[PDB]
Amino acid sequence: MIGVLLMKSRANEEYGLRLGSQIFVKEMTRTGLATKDGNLHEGDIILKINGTVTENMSLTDARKLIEKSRGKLQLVVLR
Amino acid sequence: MIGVLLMKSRANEEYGLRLGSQIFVKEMTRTGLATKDGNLHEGDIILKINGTVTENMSLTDARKLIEKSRGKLQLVVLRD
């Protein structure tokens, strides 16, 4: 970990920092289909869930898309 | 990019997939303090903003925390 401190003044009032969010694989259970399928890795960045892009999507909204899948979950994953 | 397809049946009804979200540095502008300070990198994962942990925080909420910093922004960033 490193700390970074940005401080405004009349020389520069702009942080000049654009943030995003990404959805990632936190854990795969030993007993689940994710593990049994064997393709997904913990820490993988999920790019799409069932056609819908996940960049900047909230975790809550991404979880809703998983509940919506109705037993068919097509993921696209960064590699 | 690779595709992964998980399919439920009576043999296994558990995806067994826990998701998280992380906040990351999308861009630093050429003219901004982030660039001028020189420590932050594009693609860095932000772990905390002014003491508040960012794992699983929405982008909207994280952005609110940057607006609340009032000209002093202390970040903790993943290097590990």
Curated annotation (Swiss-Prot), chain B:
Domain named PDZ: residues: 3-80
Residues recorded as bearing Phosphoserine in the entry: 21
Tissue expression pattern: This protein is found in epithelial cell junctions. Isoform A1 is abundant in the heart and brain. Detected in brain and skeletal muscle. It is present almost exclusively in normal tissues. Isoform C1 is expressed at high level in the kidney, pancreas, heart and placenta. Not detected in brain and skeletal muscle. Found in normal as well as in most neoplastic tissues.
Cellular compartments annotated: Cell junction, Adherens junction; Cell membrane; Cell junction, Tight junction; Nucleus
Similarity section: Belongs to the MAGUK family.
Quaternary structure and interacting proteins, as annotated: Homodimer. Interacts (via PDZ2 domain) with TJP1/ZO1 (via PDZ2 domain). Interacts with OCLN. Interacts with UBN1. Interacts with SAFB in the nucleus. Interacts with SCRIB. Interacts with USP53 (via the C-terminal region). Interacts with claudins, including CLDN1, CLDN2, CLDN3, CLDN5 and CLDN7. Interacts with CLDN18. Interacts (via N-terminus) with CTNNA1.
Disease: Hypercholanemia, familial, 1: A disorder characterized by elevated serum bile acid concentrations, itching, and fat malabsorption. Cholestasis, progressive familial intrahepatic, 4: A disorder characterized by early onset of cholestasis that progresses to hepatic fibrosis, cirrhosis, and end-stage liver disease before adulthood. PFIC4 inheritance is autosomal recessive.
Functional summary from the UniProt entry: Plays a role in tight junctions and adherens junctions. Acts as a positive regulator of RANKL-induced osteoclast differentiation, potentially via mediating downstream transcriptional activity.
Protein name as it appears in the record: Tight junction protein 2
Organism listed in the record: Homo sapiens
Interval of the full protein contained in this chain: 306 to 384 of 1190
